[PDB]
Design a protein that fits this description.
part of a larger assembly; 2 chains; A: mainly alpha; rod-shaped; B: mainly alpha; 2 helices; Flagellar hook-associated protein 1 (chain B); Flagellar hook-associated protein (chain A)
Chain lengths: 52, 49
């Protein structure tokens, strides 16, 4: 029983908390694709608009 | 990064106003060109005599 308690405390010190990590994982995924879209599109339109 | 951004604002280069100015000075150039054309026409009018 003491060993079970100990490994519980170990866990505590090291958490996947799967749900939090994957929720923030999806958030960051959306943010990533958004930032890349920003770069490509904005840079793009401005180039050939300005060159002309 | 922040101070570099600041500095670039002054000493940096950006293409938009550059090509706008290209148009602008080309127009100035053509203006002087037609001025020269007029300079021709007046003298020719003299020569007719």
């Amino acid at each position: 029983d003491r060993a079970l308690g100990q490994k519980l405390q170990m866990s505590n010190l090291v958490d996947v908390d799967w749900n939090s990590v994957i929720s923030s994982y999806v958030m960051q995924q959306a943010a990533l694709q958004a930032s890349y879209k920003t770069f490509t599109d904005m840079q793009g339109m401005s180039l050939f608009q300005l060159n002309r | 990064k922040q101070l570099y951004k600041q500095q670039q604002s002054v000493s940096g280069v950006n293409l938009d106003e550059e090509y706008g100015n290209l148009q602008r000075y080309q127009q100035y150039y053509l203006a002087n060109a037609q001025v020269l054309q007029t300079a021709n026409a007046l003298f020719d009018a003299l020569l007719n005599i």
